[PDB]
């Protein structure tokens, strides 16, 4: 053709940040379980 | 040639200030996520 002459995004980012936080929590939990097993002998 | 003898700008500035605020909010949020991860072990 001729020469001529945001809220959703922010929300998506918030959802992503949330997911990352959940993943971090899951990881931390996994580490705690491993530590308890190691001390179990 | 011979010797002879504002609203849009303000709006643009407002948009800029807004963007800066959004950036600051994103940064603060990023810092919070980092702090939560550090405490996760």
């Amino acid at each position: 053709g001729k020469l001529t002459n945001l809220s959703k995004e922010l929300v998506n980012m918030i959802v992503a940040q949330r997911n990352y936080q959940s993943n971090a929590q899951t990881i931390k939990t996994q580490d705690q379980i491993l530590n308890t097993l190691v001390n179990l002998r | 040639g011979k010797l002879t003898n504002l609203s849009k700008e303000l709006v643009n500035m407002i948009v800029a200030q807004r963007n800066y605020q959004s950036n600051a909010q994103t940064i603060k949020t990023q810092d919070q996520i980092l702090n939560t991860l550090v405490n996760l072990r």
Binding site: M13, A16, Q17, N23, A24, I27, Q30 | S22, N23, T26
Partner: peptide, 24 residues
Amino acid sequence: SFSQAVSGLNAAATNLDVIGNNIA
């Protein structure tokens, strides 16, 4: 499983960074 979770977290962080760059 832990390694996979870490990789997923890294991917999410990268996506967030990309989104921030796009917004900028």
